[PDB]
Amino acid sequence: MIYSRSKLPSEGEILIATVKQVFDYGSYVSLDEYGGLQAFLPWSEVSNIRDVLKENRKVIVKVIRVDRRKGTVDVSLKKVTDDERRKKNLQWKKIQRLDKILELVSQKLKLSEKDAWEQVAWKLEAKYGDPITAIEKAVKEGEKILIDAGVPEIWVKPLLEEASKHAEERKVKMSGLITVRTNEPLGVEKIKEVISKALENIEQDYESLLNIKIYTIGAPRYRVDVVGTNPKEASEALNQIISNLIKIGKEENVDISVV
Amino acid sequence: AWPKVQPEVNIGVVGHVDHGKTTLVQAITGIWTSGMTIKLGYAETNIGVCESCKKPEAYVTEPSCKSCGSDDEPKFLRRISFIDAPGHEVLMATMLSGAALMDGAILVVAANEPFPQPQTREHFVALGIIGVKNLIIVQNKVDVVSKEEALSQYRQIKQFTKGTWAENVPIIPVSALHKINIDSLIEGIEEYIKTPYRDLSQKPVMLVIRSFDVNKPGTQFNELKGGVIGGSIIQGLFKVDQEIKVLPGLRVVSYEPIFTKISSIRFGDEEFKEAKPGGLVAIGTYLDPSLTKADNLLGSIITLADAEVPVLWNIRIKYNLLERVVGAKEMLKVDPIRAKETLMLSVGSSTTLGIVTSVKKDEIEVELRRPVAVWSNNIRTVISRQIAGRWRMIGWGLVEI
Numbered sequence: 001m002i003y004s005r006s007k008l009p010s011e012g013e014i015l016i017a018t019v020k021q022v023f024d025y026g027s028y029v030s031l032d033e034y035g036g037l038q039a040f041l042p043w044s045e046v047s048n049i050r051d052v053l054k055e056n057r058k059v060i061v062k063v064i065r066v067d068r069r070k071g072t073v074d075v076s077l078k079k080v081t082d083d084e085r086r087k088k089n090l091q092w093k094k095i096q097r098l099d100k101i102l103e104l105v106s107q108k109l110k111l112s113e114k115d116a117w118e119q120v121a122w123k124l125e126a127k128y129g130d131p132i133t134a135i136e137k138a139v140k141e142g143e144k145i146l147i148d149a150g151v152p153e154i155w156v157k158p159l160l161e162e163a164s165k166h167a168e169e170r171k172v173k174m175s176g177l178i179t180v181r182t183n184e185p186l187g188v189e190k191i192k193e194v195i196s197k198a199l200e201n202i203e204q205d206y207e208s209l210l211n212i213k214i215y216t217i218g219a220p221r222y223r224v225d226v227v228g229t230n231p232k233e234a235s236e237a238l239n240q241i242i243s244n245l246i247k248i249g250k251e252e253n254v255d256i257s258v259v
Numbered sequence: 260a261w262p263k264v265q266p267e268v269n270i271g272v273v274g275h276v277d278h279g280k281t282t283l284v285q286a287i288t289g290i291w292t293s294g295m296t297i298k299l300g301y302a303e304t305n306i307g308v309c310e311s312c313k314k315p316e317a318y319v320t321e322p323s324c325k326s327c328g329s330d331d332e333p334k335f336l337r338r339i340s341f342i343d344a345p346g347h348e349v350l351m352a353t354m355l356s357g358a359a360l361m362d363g364a365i366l367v368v369a370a371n372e373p374f375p376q377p378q379t380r381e382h383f384v385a386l387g388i389i390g391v392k393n394l395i396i397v398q399n400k401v402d403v404v405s406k407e408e409a410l411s412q413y414r415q416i417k418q419f420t421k422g423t424w425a426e427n428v429p430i431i432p433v434s435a436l437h438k439i440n441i442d443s444l445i446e447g448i449e450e451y452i453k454t455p456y457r458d459l460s461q462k463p464v465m466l467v468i469r470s471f472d473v474n475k476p477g478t479q480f481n482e483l484k485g486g487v488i489g490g491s492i493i494q495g496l497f498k499v500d501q502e503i504k505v506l507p508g509l510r511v512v513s514y515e516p517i518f519t520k521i522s523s524i525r526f527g528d529e530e531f532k533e534a535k536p537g538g539l540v541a542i543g544t545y546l547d548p549s550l551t552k553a554d555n556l557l558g559s560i561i562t563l564a565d566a567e568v569p570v571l572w573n574i575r576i577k578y579n580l581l582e583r584v585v586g587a588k589e590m591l592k593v594d595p596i597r598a599k600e601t602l603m604l605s606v607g608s609s610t611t612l613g614i615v616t617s618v619k620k621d622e623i624e625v626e627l628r629r630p631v632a633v634w635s636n637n638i639r640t641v642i643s644r645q646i647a648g649r650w651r652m653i654g655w656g657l658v659e660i
């Protein structure tokens with residue numbers, strides 16, 4: 001749940017939506033950033049389609065048209081730019097962190113998420129900024145940051161605490177050791193490419209998770225870290241990566257393999 | 260009022276073992292080359308003189324004259340660097356390696372020991388044979404001997420430095436440990452080891468004595484620095500952003516050139532835009548840190564890309580041999596060179612093995628296990644033979660093309 005401070009989405013807007021139903025002549029998606037407001041994704045707007053148009057995948061889409069009168073909306077995943085697909089994607093993990101927090105803070109304060117999104121998130125919104133970053137300061141600095149926002153003081157503490165020790169008992173780590181060699185004149189750039197090409201848009205496909213790091217541990221021996229919430233999405237994400245590397249590498253003059 | 264400039268000259272620091280080479284260098288620069296030396300040590304220092312007062316003492320290491328007499332800020336003469344060679348009989352191979360970056364040297368005889376020690380002789384004839392003639396002898400451990408002992412020896416050093424090419428090869432006693440008399444040594448090296456002229460028109464050619472992966476364990480692929488290749492320029496001059504190549508490069512059997520671009524140029528702690536002869540540079544390259552880690556590219560050479568450099572497997576050498584094998588306790592006569600013999604050909608900063616295929620009066624043909632990259636027709640070469648378990652220098656020569 002991510003209650004929105006609006007009934008319908010601005011036309012021409014981008015936003016995380018989730019595929020809810022696939023029919024013959026079209027498919028109903030669900031606008032997350034808007035209480036799961038059902039929009040319509042028509043074929044003429046789409047495009048392995050087997051994995052995008054999946055039972056519950058979360059893809060990002062543009063808001064074709066909005067009929068404020070009938071109050072219905074149609075979106076497209078084709079109009080979404082490669083730029084809008086990355087930038088408006090980082091917003092996801094952030095907007096996805098804010099979610100888990102409130103869904104937990106409220107669950108604890110025997111309250112409601114809408115109450116959690118209208119006093120907390122909505123108000124931290126006035127103080128310019130992803131309410132998730134204004135909280136970023138709170139835990140480190142002090143609960144003086146929220147109160148100034150006008151965030152009812154029922155949340156303040158429950159928040160802070162529930163924000164810190166959250167990822168902890170929600171964190172798991174998976175890793176692999178690989179070998180990366182090159183003879184290319186700028187082989188250090190090629191390694192900084194093949195890696196940041198294979199380790200790209202992974203934050204959507206093998207989905208969501210918490211953090212990914214690729215570093216040098218030895219000379220040609222590198223390690224990859226996939227720390228997320230779901231232990232069982234371990235390899236899932238780590239395997240795809242370790243493979244993406246090999247593939248792009250074994251095609252980009254960069255020799256890559258697993259130990 | 261001093262400047263930040265890269266070293267002007269390279270001064271090797273050779274001698275028998277544990278006679279205190281690194282210590283002396285640490286007594287002149289404050290820096291020490293991280294027990295016994297195994298790899299060539301390196302250190303830099305600015306050398307200035309005190310216009311207003313008495314020498315030796317007038318030779319300052321730092322912009323300050325208020326150390327003996329007084330105040331006008333001493334004048335900068337040059338920034339010198341040292342090549343702290345190992346001394347243990349086993350590492351002979353690496354000193355010769357360093358001998359090829361030496362513009363002058365400082366033989367270091369231990370006062371508290373029977374002067375003519377094996378490595379003392381070896382490093383000595385080794386310099387003469389090579390060309391490192393601008394020599395300075397340094398009696399060093401004086402702080403622990405008789406005022407007659409250290410003078411009886413001076414006699415011998417004087418005796419020894421006779422018939423040879425060591426005419427007036429100054430002998431300056433010091434106490435590297437207590438940094439006593441280091442002033443006159445600077446007076447000495449600032450007189451006999453004169454910075455040589457460097458025509459920068461020549462084709463840039465650098466000898467590599469080191470290479471390594473700078474990346475600390477844990478660095479994210481995000482900020483991985485490319486491999487660094489440490490060496491010494493012998494002629495011309497490289498500048499950042501240049502297309503360079505390492506020879507013989509990486510091996511496959513054959514050796515195909517490793518090309519790259521000079522990412523950075525660094526001398527001592529400071530970074531420059533260009534590098535020239537003298538001093539020890541660290542050429543930052545854009546290539547995978549793997550190619551240049553432990554020290555893989557040691558003995559290679561760097562030249563601008565598309566330069567005419569023969570990389571031979573076989574090489575003709577006009578040679579000469581030493582009458583004895585100064586280096587083993589026993590001064591055994593050097594036996595003729597026999598065909599099908601395995602020798603150690605030390606060329607440039609590179610050391611290699613090869614089986615003699617042809618042998619005449621003063622010319623031998625060697626089939627090397629690794630190719631050598633010949634950038635000139637004079638490439639001095641020193642020849643070692645495995646006399647007794649350990650490798651001994653039995654002669655020298657020139658590589659012809």
Ligand SMILES: Nc1nc2c(ncn2[C@@H]2O[C@H](COP(=O)(O)OP(=O)(O)NP(=O)(O)O)[C@@H](O)[C@H]2O)c(=O)[nH]1
Binds near residue numbers: 282294296399
């Ligand atoms: N009394 C005295 N001891 C000295 C002097 N110079 C060096 N030593 C001592 O001699 C020992 C070896 O010194 P060191 O400088 O490592 O010798 P080196 O010739 O550089 N060693 P290597 O040949 O292995 O590279 C040390 O214990 C050092 O303190 C000196 O002038 N006087």
Ligand SMILES: [Mg+2]
Binds near residue numbers: 281294296
């Ligand atoms: Mg030493």
Ligand SMILES: [Zn+2]
Binds near residue numbers: 312316317324327328
């Ligand atoms: Zn003075």
